[PDB]
Design a binder for this molecule. Structure first.
Ligand SMILES: C[n+]1cn([C@@H]2O[C@H](COP(=O)(O)OP(=O)(O)OP(=O)(O)OC[C@H]3O[C@@H](n4cnc5c(N)ncnc54)[C@H](O)[C@@H]3O)[C@@H](O)[C@H]2O)c2nc(N)[nH]c(=O)c21
Ligand SMILES: [Zn+2]
Ligand SMILES: [Zn+2]
Lengths: 125, 293
């Protein structure tokens, strides 16, 4: 586990596009990053993507946000222009069918700018 | 049975008043393990149960609440206890965490290194410590009071803790401090809380609730640790996480506890009573500055 995490986290230090490097790695069958911080929650939340408290519905799990951020986990520079991570200090809801790879889910999807639900997994605009 | 649905067990005054020699701690389920609900980290369950017990205590819960979390790294490079604190605390609470080696965390401020390198410039409202020194496992002679990181924590209580503030500091059979027990006598109330998730460990969180800055209870710390072990040796505790099955009231109550600046001489009976009920904090209301030195 730790040896395996250390491997993919090492790999995304050898690349100019860590997001693509991670997604290409897991798409080719590489082991997703483990040891994400899954919370226990009353599955009675709003279901939005990113939230100051856990907001998981019955169809989601909530993670501590830093732990599902590739840039935090790999200790590399965040791509956001403001420099501030979008997840760290917050909670991230993941559809329950995607809990095998929370980091890959996060790198592959985008909260809706209007309703802040995941596009394709909640956003109904 | 109700015990299983509680988050854990708190040392009762029945054992606080005993007078016994310090004995070996012998737990009938020692090191038995319980699988974790949904396979979250064990520290998720442990911190949640600590928080649930603190929900029953008279914690002061102000705006911009100042929380420092020591020993916050675990599980090879992450901080599940910090994320539980983020789930528990008010959204405007400030969490500072710290551990010896690098880790990733949801705290507002994360500092690496010995806890001694953590310079608290102001006073804080809540101290959580999960620190434990590995050398404590090298049990040779008799079980004596330890210095280690407790010296730092004792000084922090005496200088960097708001009146009305509280502390939850992990101890074990062999990881403990006479001086820290004796400082519990400067709080309105104190106990040791043992989670049900880790009931099979001599681990307990030494709780100081509402710091008064003056001695309320005269405690002999060596004797009190002998009483803590006597309590553990006397008290069946079955592993359990049932308390986490209903999380609807988990979050810390939004008490809006006021923060007042007061001179020592102005502290009277009314102020001590408010501090002891979780209804007041006394400290600076500057901007908090906590850095590596
Ligand atoms: C309570 N107890 C202690 N010992 C013996 O006394 C020694 C020291 O006892 P201790 O003070 O460490 O207490 P205990 O063994 O209960 O602590 P435990 O391992 O549960 O650790 C508690 C917490 O400390 C931290 N911790 C433990 N080891 C480390 C570590 N190596 N590094 C960082 N943290 C650690 C973790 O948070 C852990 O959850 C034990 O290593 C064992 O030989 C016992 N032996 C029997 N046969 N039955 C017991 O009931 C018993
Ligand atoms: Zn990040
Ligand atoms: Zn939308």
């Amino acid at each position: 586990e730790f040896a395996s995490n250390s491997s993919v986290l090492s790999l995304v230090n050898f690349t100019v596009d860590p997001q693509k490097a991670y997604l290409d790695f897991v798409n080719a069958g590489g082991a997703p990053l483990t040891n994400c911080v899954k919370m226990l929650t009353p599955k009675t939340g709003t279901g939005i993507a990113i939230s100051v408290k856990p907001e998981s519905t019955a169809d989601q799990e909530t993670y501590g946000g830093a732990s599902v951020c590739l840039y935090c986990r790999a200790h590399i520079e965040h791509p956001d222009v403001s420099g501030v991570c979008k997840y760290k200090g917050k909670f991230v809801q993941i559809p329950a069918q995607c809990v095998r790879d929370p980091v890959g889910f996060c790198l592959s999807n985008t909260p809706c700018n209007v309703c802040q639900y995941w596009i394709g997994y909640g956003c109904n605009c | 049975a109700s015990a299983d649905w509680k988050p854990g067990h708190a040392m009762p005054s029945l054992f606080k008043v005993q007078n016994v020699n310090l004995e070996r701690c012998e737990l009938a389920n020692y090191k038995q393990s319980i699988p974790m609900p949904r396979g979250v980290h064990m520290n998720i369950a442990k911190y949640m149960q600590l928080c649930q017990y603190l929900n029953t205590c008279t914690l002061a819960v102000p705006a911009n609440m100042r929380v420092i979390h020591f020993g916050a790294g675990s599980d090879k490079g992450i901080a599940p206890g910090t994320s539980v604190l983020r789930q528990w605390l008010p959204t405007d609470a400030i969490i500072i965490d710290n551990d010896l080696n690098e880790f990733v965390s949801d705290a507002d401020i994360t500092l690496f290194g010995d806890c001694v390198t953590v310079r608290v410039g102001q006073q804080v409202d809540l101290v959580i410590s999960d620190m434990y020194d590995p050398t404590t496992k090298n049990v040779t002679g008799s079980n004596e009071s330890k210095a280690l990181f407790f010296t730092y924590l004792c000084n922090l209580i005496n200088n960097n803790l708001a009146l009305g503030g509280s502390v939850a500091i992990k101890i074990t059979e062999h990881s403990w401090s006479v001086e820290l027990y004796e400082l519990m006598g400067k709080f309105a109330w104190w106990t040791v809380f043992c989670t049900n998730a880790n009931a099979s460990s001599s681990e307990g969180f030494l709780l100081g609730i509402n710091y008064l800055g003056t001695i309320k209870e005269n405690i002999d710390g060596g004797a009190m640790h002998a009483n803590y072990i006597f309590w553990r040796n006397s008290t069946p505790m079955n592993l359990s996480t049932y308390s986490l099955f209903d999380l609807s009231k988990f979050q810390l109550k939004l008490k809006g506890t006021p923060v007042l600046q007061l001179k020592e001489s102005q502290i009277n009976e009314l102020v001590i009573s408010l501090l002891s009920q979780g209804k007041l904090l006394i400290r600076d209301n500057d901007t908090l500055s906590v850095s590596t030195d």
